[PDB]
Amino acid sequence: DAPEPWQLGFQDAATPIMQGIMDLHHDIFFFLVQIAVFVLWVLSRALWCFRSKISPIPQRIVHGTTIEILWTIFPSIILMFIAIPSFTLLYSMDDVVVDPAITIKAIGHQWYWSYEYSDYNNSDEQSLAFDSYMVPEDDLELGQLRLLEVDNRVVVPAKTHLRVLITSADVLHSWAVPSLGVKCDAVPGRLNQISTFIQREGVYYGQCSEICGTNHAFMPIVVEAVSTKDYGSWVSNQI
Amino acid sequence: DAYETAKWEKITYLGIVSCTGLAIYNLSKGHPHTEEPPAYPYLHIRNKEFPWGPDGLFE
Amino acid sequence: PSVVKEIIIGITLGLAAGSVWKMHHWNEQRKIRTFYDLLEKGEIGVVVD
Amino acid sequence: PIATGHEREEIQASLEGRDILEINHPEGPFGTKEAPAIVKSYFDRRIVGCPGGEGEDEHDVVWFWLENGKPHECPVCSQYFELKVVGPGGDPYG
Amino acid sequence: EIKLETAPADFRFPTTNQTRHCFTRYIEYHRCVAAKGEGASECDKFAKYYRSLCPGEWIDRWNEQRENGTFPGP
Amino acid sequence: MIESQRHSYHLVDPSPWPISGSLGALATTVGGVMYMHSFQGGATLLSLGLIFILYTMFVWWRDVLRESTLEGHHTKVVQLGLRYGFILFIVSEVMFLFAFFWAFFHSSLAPTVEIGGIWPPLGIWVLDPWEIPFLNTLILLSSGAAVTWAHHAILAGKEKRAVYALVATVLLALVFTGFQGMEYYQAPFTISDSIYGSTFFLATGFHGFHVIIGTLFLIICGIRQYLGHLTKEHHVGFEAAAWYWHFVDVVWLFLFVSIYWWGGI
Amino acid sequence: MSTKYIVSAILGSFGIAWVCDYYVSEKKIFGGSTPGTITNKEWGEETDKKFQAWPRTAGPPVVVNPITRQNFVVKS
Amino acid sequence: YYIHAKHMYNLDRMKHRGLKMSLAVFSAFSIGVAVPVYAVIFQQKKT
Amino acid sequence: MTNPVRWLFSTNHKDIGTLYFIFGAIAGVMGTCFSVLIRMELARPGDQILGGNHQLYNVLITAHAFLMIFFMVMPAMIGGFGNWFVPILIGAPDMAFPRLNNISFWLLPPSLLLLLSSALVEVGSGTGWTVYPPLSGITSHSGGAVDLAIFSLHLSGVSSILGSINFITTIFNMRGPGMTMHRSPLFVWSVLVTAFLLLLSLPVLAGAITMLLTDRNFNTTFFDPAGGGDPILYQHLFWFFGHPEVYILILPGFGIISHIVSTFSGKPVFGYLGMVYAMISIGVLGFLVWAHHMFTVGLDVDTRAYFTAATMIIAVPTGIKIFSWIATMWGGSIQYKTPMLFAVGFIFLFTIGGLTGIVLANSGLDIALHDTYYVVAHFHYVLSMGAVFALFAGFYYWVGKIFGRTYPETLGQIHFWITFFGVNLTFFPMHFLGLSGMPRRIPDYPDAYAGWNALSSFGSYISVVGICCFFVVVTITSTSGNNITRANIPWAVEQNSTTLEWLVQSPPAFHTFGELPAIKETKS
Amino acid sequence: SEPPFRPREKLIEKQKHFQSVHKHTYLKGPYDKITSVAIPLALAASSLYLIGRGIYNMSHGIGK
Ligand code: HEA
Ligand code: HEA
Ligand SMILES: [Cu+2]
Ligand SMILES: [Mg+2]
Ligand SMILES: [Zn+2]
């Protein structure tokens, strides 16, 4: 969920989206390691068996037939095989058959985020709105991470659906938490919809991935997934 | 050889005659402006004041 | 020098490497599947106390 | 009309019926059995390219720096290239 | 005791522009308030929907514009 | 002489107009920034750089005319190459105005929620697309017909009526730019208005600037034809002018249709 | 012929890169700083013991990286 | 002038050519690794 | 006075090529100094040498990107090798339209001055390589740095348009006699295709940044959210330029590599028509996909699917090209000189970069990997390795020709090995960090990512050693007291050469041709 | 068929004059002496000085 020192590959998954992403990347990498090793082998054997001391005669062939069509066709079926899963992932990730259970606007201000779980208020003025500031260097306890810990984190009920409406107020931004596999852009004019559904409790960390002005990378995002009873208690207490 | 020159001469003369008539039509119109629209947010924006700031060019 | 033999051995090595990587991926997938399976129907929880 | 210099020379040639650089297209039949496959050159030695070919076969292109005193045969398609100066034979840069 | 529900998944907007979703819900609520006014049930429904959808800054700015008479669109 | 050069292509002689024009461009750009942001030397630097570019361009075309008309260095092949280069330049300009049209369309097919989801934005009094813009289209259409008349003057050996056709075309182009100026002054909305006004004015302004440069090209060709520099067989300057003017007319036709007809609907 | 020279020069290049790195980022011949989170040398300790049980705002402490670290609670 | 020369450069001729080319390449490198550093130095010399 | 005339004034396509080469070397050194500064800042977590002022760091990344993507590869592929070896190779006298050649080259240095002054004014341009609108807006910058940078892009774009028109008209008109289109070598062909892309795409970038300029200063609303005009419009326009822009930095590399492999395998390029058609198709399909750079912004599903398919289809022809090159080494009589070393390294590392690109081309994978150092590794392998290694290969292969001297061989191989090791160490951990999930363009990173960035920082210094070795090579070449021979090099001694440019002289005389070549053209 | 408003022998005289000098292209004629050694030269000198002063002022943030 959090970044690890000397780590290879993706972080851990807490979303069916991220499971799909891991599987798709692994299929792609399988096909492409096959491609790369085969190309390296053929190049090496071509360079080494004809190294100016075994074959000093150019052997003069320039027109080839029935092999050019073969390396035109076989990469095509390779691409078909590595594009069968990607399309399935796209068209099984787009659909939201179920209704979202909550709605968490994530307004990307200039160098700090804000959130509003507005769907709990009888009035028009919104209750339950706060700001997500990065904790400075000297305001940390002995354990937390650096420039990635946040005051008053995002709270979310676990094992129940979500719908986060990314948008901005000053400049381009991006809501990006990798452990959930969520990345989208907050453009000052539009209201992007992300439907996500966590599967387990715990905290997940992420950062901004777009050039905001100067405190870029100091504008982090923290999402907690907690039990539904505790989420209810927290919301009722925060109102 | 010269028939083409004569033909395009004729149609260009027709063009300028019709255009002069239409200019006579368009002119002599008073052009009274209607009332200014309500100040919607997207009208008359000033992100950075012009070098000749207060009013836009051609006003 | 035999062109077909070289291409055959290249394809075979590519498939061997892909099979090794796929075995890795299958083991990782099994670990994830059993972890979540238990997380629903087993002793494993996630909150410490 | 009005013209002087290079365009004047070009148009005088195209009015007299002669082609100015007709020596720059050899266009000869392939090979040398008893008749050399000849080119023409305004200088002592000149670049010539062979694509070869009776009309069906051909090799892509080979550039050889043909010279006067020595006929040169194409490396791959093996035809002679005998040169015949139609100008003052001199080193191309004097 | 809490509600734990929000705006539904609308058939009209399967894309990622809840900007259009926001504007549509706002217009429907104010069409209520204009025409019916006493359809309090359905129009509280519409009100809850656009409150859940539209960000607070947008809602406040649009309400002030509507009061000022400079609200683009219906 | 060609018989010693052994090839009919053109070999030019050194001229400092490349470097001088580049220095003029640097002057224009730094002056542009220093006038865009308030500074002491802004306006004078921008004007000096702009007239520098004008001067270098003038002496450059003068040098090309001098060579090709008096020295006679243009042979058939370089004559063809000039046509090639100018067609490529027109293609580049087509792509530029395509980018501008894309900006307009991407801003006007699906209008955002913040201009009412409608087009044109409420409170922008769109020009009637039939009073002035129709007259401008008719004027440019007659100008194109007059350019074709000039071309058939040059080709048919009648080298006297060519100046008459060219002067008629220049008069029509001036009438067009005058009416465009009248439209700008009588505009019921300015540039700093919504995306509608913004894209309208940017596209129309660049089209008018292209009209100015095409008109001045035509003026140069008219002076040359009056002086006798053009002949039935050998004339590329006029052909370039004709192609450029046809380009400007076609761009105006697309502009009129899309913006004035559709945008007002 | 030259493999001696090539290999010797490669090793010398690694040596020079190491020396420049050591002077520019270990002793900072060009001014700079080092975080308080790395010089304490006990921060990673607590960071790992906290991956065992990460504190939370609403709810008891909860684990992070459950799969890739194989750390998680039992029947309760 | 050397339009009619057998070699466009004819580099051998100049005066020992060694100091000249050495200074040329070293000044090329100096201009390549002086301005990029100088920009940062000036920015810190500012606010 | 005669020397200043011959340099500042002369048309002489060869001399303009020499000037382009000198400018390319200077710009490359400047870009590498910026890259080393970036690496020095990123060596350890915390503030390393910038001591704050992350704005200056963003300025540094922007200036590095511009310097090396506009002033190093383009002035060396097109202006450097193009200007020289298009008319010499095609068999023609001095290029068509020489004055355009000169004006383009002398437009470039004022563009350089604008870029540096943009990096130097009141605060700086901290907007990244791809200037995005809202950050480059007048509310968020208000400096003028972005104005200067935009004008720099205008000058560079105008110069490249002039050069592209030059090359297109030269190839279409200024060929020799008898030489059909299908006998011009692949370097000429790649320069033609890349010139078409440069002519068609670049004006769109000029329009987009003109629109950005009039949005900043003259107070329009093209990219201001209030009043329509979303920033997505600018994303679309800039990237409709951007991808044709990146299939231009590598096509001359492809041409040079084809020539080098052909001259080292003792045999010409296998499947010539295949090469030509594949390269034309790469050029064409470089346009039909432009948003595969913005998958994570909010396009609908069908556009994402279509751009996925388009990127795969553009992947196929590069495969045809690489397999053709592998085929045209099956002949024999190879000889491992430094140009062959660099061509082989090009093929290998460009293969790695291309496979990573494929991984990135999908939609969901780009959702997970957008704007993380995975993308940086992808385009640093592709662009740096491919373009720069092709550049070095061409430089050795043809410094055999320009100056007339020849480099020392052991130093050439030493430089190849140093640079290969350094620049392949310093960019693979970028793949690993991108998988881990660190965002791109950040001056500080969490403590977790500090493991590799100490190792990658160890890679930049090796590349600096390599570049210094390269300049030692250039100086020892320009002062090598031993001219071109047969023992040194076997290329120019050929009495029969596949390419026309080797059988002329040590340097070309002044007109490159006392008399044009011919072609026998049989079947009388 | 009519020659355009000039005898066309003035052009022939001018052709003789231009082909009968021994200089580069841009220096032929007495007009071009004045033009192409004084106007662009002084103009570029003034342009260079103003460009330098402008870059200096913009960089230093003086003389707003
Ligand atoms: C031309 C393309 C090019 C090249 C060659 C390089 C070279 C290098 N780049 Fe660059 N880089 C970019 C293009 C390029 N880069 C771009 C476009 C970005 C994006 C910026 C952003 O995202 O906004 C970027 C960003 C970028 C970053 C991320 C910045 C950020 O995240 O904050 C980093 C991080 O270290 C980096 C590092 C390096 C390094 C270590 C090299 C080293 O390889 C140094 C190069 C080494 C060489 C071997 C080349 C030098 C060669 C010569 C000088 C000889 C020339 C010869 C003649 C012409 C005869 N680059
Ligand atoms: C330098 C030129 C260049 C080249 C050649 C490529 C190659 C490719 N690129 Fe690259 N790309 C860039 C320039 C380039 N790219 C740049 C500059 C960026 C960063 C932009 C930014 O800062 O935002 C980027 C980033 C980038 C992204 C992500 C942008 C973002 O989300 O951050 C994507 C994804 O769509 C992409 C796509 C591709 C694809 C599909 C190819 C393919 O064409 C690769 C083709 C090559 C092959 C695949 C190898 C040879 C093929 C075989 C040996 C045959 C076998 C293969 C198959 C089975 C088909 N590129
Ligand atoms: Cu792309
Ligand atoms: Mg992004
Ligand atoms: Zn032959």
Give the count of beta carbons closer than 10 Å to the beta carbon of residue I380.
Answer: 18
Phi first, then psi, for residue F129 (nearest 5°) are -80, 15
* Cross-chain residue pair I315–A79, CB shorter than 8 Å: yes
Q: What angle do CA I158, I160, I165 make, to 5 degrees?
A: 95
Q: Which residues does residue A175 pair with via DSSP β-bridges, in sequence order?
A: A184
Give the count of beta carbons closer than 10 Å to the beta carbon of residue A85.
Answer: 17
For chain G, the three-class secondary structure string (H helix, E strand, C coil) is CCHHHHHHHHHHHHHHHHHHHHHHHHCCCCCCCCCHHHHCCCHHHHHHHHHHCECCCCCCCECCCHHHHCCCECCC
> β-strand I518-519 against A173-177: which pairing, if any?
unpaired
CA of I201, nearest ligand number:
3
Residue E54 CA to residue E34 CA, distance in Å, equals: 20
Q: Which residues does residue D47 pair with via DSSP β-bridges, in sequence order?
A: D65
Residue I162 CA to residue I140 CA, distance in Å, equals: 35
For J2-56, the three-class secondary structure string (H helix, E strand, C coil) is CCCCCCCHHHHHHHHHHHCCCCCCCCCCHHHHHHHHHHHHHHHHHHHHHHHHHHH
Mutate to test the pocket of ligand 2, among I318, I351, I371, I427 (most ligand atoms within 8 A of CB): I318
Q: Which residues does residue I237 pair with via DSSP β-bridges, in sequence order?
A: none
Both tokens assigned to F262: 């559709």
Tell me, what amino acid is at J4? P
Tell me, what amino acid is at H18? G
Phi first, then psi, for residue A111 (nearest 5°) are 80, 20
Cα D77 to middle of ligand 5, angstroms: 4
Sorted by where each begins, the domain ranges of chain D are 1-94
Burial tier of I428 (Cβ tally within 10 Å: 0-12, 13-18, 19+):
middle
Q: Is there a contact between D64 and D72 (Cβ–Cβ < 8 Å)?
A: yes
Residue F123 CA to residue F197 CA, distance in Å, equals: 11
- Buried-exposed string I129-153: b where 16+ CB fall within 10 A, e elsewhere: ebbbbbbbbbebbebbbbbbbbbbb
* Cross-chain residue pair D2–J19, CB shorter than 8 Å: no
Alpha helix ranges (H) inside I79-185:
83-85, 87-90, 98-120, 145-173
Q: Which helix (H) or strand (E) holds C24?
A: helix C3-41
Both tokens assigned to A17: 């989206």
Both tokens assigned to F165: 């056709």
Please report where in the chains the tokens 């890349």 appear, as a residue. I194
Residue D1 CA to residue F69 CA, distance in Å, equals: 12
- Buried-exposed string F170-180: b where 16+ CB fall within 10 A, e elsewhere: bebbbbbbebb
Sheet holding D46-50, edge to edge: I496-497, D62-66, D46-50, I518-519
Burial tier of J40 (Cβ tally within 10 Å: 0-12, 13-18, 19+):
buried
Taking alpha carbons only, the member of F137, F199, F121, F220 closest to residue F172 is: F137
Q: Which helix (H) or strand (E) holds A166?
A: strand A164-168
Burial tier of H13 (Cβ tally within 10 Å: 0-12, 13-18, 19+):
exposed
Taking alpha carbons only, the member of A209, A211, C32, A144 closest to residue I448 is: A144
Tell me, what amino acid is at G43? W
What does chain G come to in residues? 76
Sorted by where each begins, the domain ranges of chain G are 1-32, 35-76
Non-local CB neighbours of F121 within 8 Å, separated by 6+ positions: B40, B42, B43, E72, F111, F115, F193, F194, F195, F196, I227, I228
Q: Which helix (H) or strand (E) holds I347?
A: helix I338-361
Residue I116 CA to residue H35 CA, distance in Å, equals: 9
Tell me, what amino acid is at I456? S
Q: Is there a contact between F64 and F237 (Cβ–Cβ < 8 Å)?
A: no
Rounded to the nearest 10°, the torsion over CA D59, D64, D70, D71 is 20
Residue F170 CA to residue F162 CA, distance in Å, equals: 12
Q: Is there a contact between I286 and I247 (Cβ–Cβ < 8 Å)?
A: yes
Whether I391 lines ligand 1, by a CB cut-off of 6 Å, is: yes
* Cross-chain residue pair B40–E69, CB shorter than 8 Å: no
Sorted by where each begins, the domain ranges of chain F are 1-73, 74-265
Q: Which residues does residue A202 pair with via DSSP β-bridges, in sequence order?
A: A225
Non-local CB neighbours of F174 within 8 Å, separated by 6+ positions: F215
Burial tier of F209 (Cβ tally within 10 Å: 0-12, 13-18, 19+):
exposed
Residue D37 CA to residue D29 CA, distance in Å, equals: 7
Give the count of beta carbons closer than 10 Å to the beta carbon of residue I275.
Answer: 23
SS3 content of chain D, % helix, strand, coil (to 5): 15, 20, 65
Q: Which chain A residues are closer than 8 Å to G33 by Cβ? A: none
Q: Is there a contact between I247 and I196 (Cβ–Cβ < 8 Å)?
A: no
Tell me the C-alpha to C-alpha distance, in Å, between residue I110 and each of F19, H35, I74, I156, I324. 10, 15, 16, 9, 41
The approach used to solve this structure was cryo-EM
Classify the C-alpha dihedral G3-G5-G8-G14 as positive or negative.
Answer: negative
Residue F119 CA to residue C15 CA, distance in Å, equals: 58
CB distance from I56 to chain H under 8 Å? yes
Tell me, what amino acid is at I293? H
Q: Is there a contact between D47 and D65 (Cβ–Cβ < 8 Å)?
A: yes
Both tokens assigned to B10: 């004729």
Cα I362 to middle of ligand 3, angstroms: 12
Residue I257 CA to residue I264 CA, distance in Å, equals: 11
* Cross-chain residue pair J19–D5, CB shorter than 8 Å: yes
Residue I111 CA to residue I116 CA, distance in Å, equals: 9
Phi first, then psi, for residue A72 (nearest 5°) are -85, -35
> β-strand I496-497 against D62-66: which pairing, if any?
antiparallel
Q: Select from I44, I51, I418 the Cβ nearest to the Cβ of G10.
A: I418
Q: Which domains does chain I have, with CATH numbers?
A: 1-479 (1.20.210.10)
What does chain C come to in residues? 49
Please give the residue range of the domain that contains residue J40: 24-64
Q: Is there a contact between B48 and I138 (Cβ–Cβ < 8 Å)?
A: yes
Residue I176 CA to residue E41 CA, distance in Å, equals: 85
Give the count of beta carbons closer than 10 Å to the beta carbon of residue C4.
Answer: 8
Q: Is there a contact between I57 and I443 (Cβ–Cβ < 8 Å)?
A: yes
Tell me the C-alpha to C-alpha distance, in Å, between residue D30 and each of D45, D47, D59, J30. 21, 18, 13, 59
Tell me, what amino acid is at F160? K
Classify the C-alpha dihedral J54-J55-J56-J62 as positive or negative.
Answer: positive
Q: Which residues does residue I483 pair with via DSSP β-bridges, in sequence order?
A: none
Which residue spans within A12-158 are E strands per DSSP?
Answer: 104-109, 112-116, 129-132, 154-157
Classify the C-alpha dihedral I79-I80-I83-I85 as positive or negative.
Answer: negative
Please report where in the chains the tokens 């709810």 appear, as a residue. G59
Both tokens assigned to I92: 């023609």
For F118-155, the three-class secondary structure string (H helix, E strand, C coil) is CCCCCCCCCCCCCCHHHHHHHHHHHHHHHHHHHHHHHH
Task: Tell me the shortest Cα–Cα distance from A34 to chain C, in angstroms.
Answer: 4
Q: Is there a contact between I340 and I334 (Cβ–Cβ < 8 Å)?
A: yes
Q: Is there a contact between A31 and A81 (Cβ–Cβ < 8 Å)?
A: yes
Q: Which chain J residues are closer than 8 Å to F38 by Cβ? A: 64
Ligand 2: atom nearest CA of I295 is 31
Q: How far is CA F257 from the centre of its chain?
A: 20
Please give the residue range of the domain that contains residue A168: 104-238
* Cross-chain residue pair F8–D6, CB shorter than 8 Å: yes
HSE, side-chain direction, 13 A CA sphere, residue I131: 31
Taking alpha carbons only, the member of I252, I262, I90, I269 closest to residue I180 is: I90
Both tokens assigned to F188: 């019921």
Residue D31 CA to residue A67 CA, distance in Å, equals: 33
Give the A-side interface with E, CB within 8 Å. 94, 96, 98-103, 105, 107, 116, 118-121, 124-126, 129, 157, 163, 165, 167, 169, 184, 189-193, 228, 232, 235-236
Phi first, then psi, for residue I522 (nearest 5°) are -75, -165
Tell me the C-alpha to C-alpha distance, in Å, between residue E8 and each of A163, E2, E11, F241, I451. 10, 18, 9, 62, 46
Q: Is there a contact between I108 and I23 (Cβ–Cβ < 8 Å)?
A: yes
Q: Is there a contact between I8 and J44 (Cβ–Cβ < 8 Å)?
A: no
Whether I291 lines ligand 2, by a CB cut-off of 6 Å, is: no
Q: Which chain A residues are closer than 8 Å to E19 by Cβ? A: 167, 189-191
* Cross-chain residue pair G61–C43, CB shorter than 8 Å: no
Tell me the C-alpha to C-alpha distance, in Å, between residue I27 and each of A224, I22, I30, I248, I251. 49, 9, 5, 18, 20
Cis peptide before I408 (omega within 30 of 0): no
Both tokens assigned to I55: 């704005």
Q: Is there a contact between A138 and G37 (Cβ–Cβ < 8 Å)?
A: no
**DSSP string computed for chain F:** -HHHH---S------SHHHHHHHHHHHHHHHHHHHHS--TTHHHHHHHHHHHHHHHHHHHHHHHHHIIIII----HHHHHHHHHHHHHHHHHHHHHHHHHHHHHHHHHSS--GGGTT-SSPTT--PPPTTSHHHHHHHHHHHHHHHHHHHHHHHHTT--SHHHHHHHHHHHHHHHHHHHHHHHHHT-SS-TTSSHHHHHHHHHHHHHHHHHHHHHHHHHHHHHHHHHT---SSS-SHHHHHHHHHHHHHHHHHHHIIIIIIIIT-
Non-local CB neighbours of A132 within 8 Å, separated by 6+ positions: A112, A113, A114, A115, A150, A151, A152, A153, A154, A220, A221, A222
- Buried-exposed string A185-208: b where 16+ CB fall within 10 A, e elsewhere: bbbbbbbbbbbbbbbbbbbbbbbb
Tell me the C-alpha to C-alpha distance, in Å, between residue I272 and each of I155, I263, I269, I275, I328. 37, 14, 6, 5, 10
Quick one: DSSP state of residue I396? H
Max CA distance (Å), chain J:
67
Phi first, then psi, for residue A52 (nearest 5°) are 65, -5
Both tokens assigned to I120: 């130097």
Q: Is there a contact between D86 and D23 (Cβ–Cβ < 8 Å)?
A: yes
CB distance from E52 to chain A under 8 Å? yes
Residue D28 CA to residue I524 CA, distance in Å, equals: 5
Please report where in the chains the tokens 């070699």 appear, as a residue. H7
Tell me the C-alpha to C-alpha distance, in Å, between residue G59 and each of A117, A197, A206, A224, I482. 19, 20, 21, 10, 80
Non-local CB neighbours of F243 within 8 Å, separated by 6+ positions: F86, F87, F90
Give the F-side interface with E, CB within 8 Å. 112-118, 121-122
Residue A69 CA to residue F162 CA, distance in Å, equals: 59
Task: Tell me the shortest Cα–Cα distance from H7 to chain D, in angstroms.
Answer: 10
Chain breaks in chain I (C to N over 2.5 A) after: none
Q: Is there a contact between H28 and I23 (Cβ–Cβ < 8 Å)?
A: no
Q: Is there a contact between D72 and D93 (Cβ–Cβ < 8 Å)?
A: no
Q: Is there a contact between F46 and F35 (Cβ–Cβ < 8 Å)?
A: yes
Please report where in the chains the tokens 């997934």 appear, as a residue. A225
Q: Which chain D residues are closer than 8 Å to H6 by Cβ? A: 93
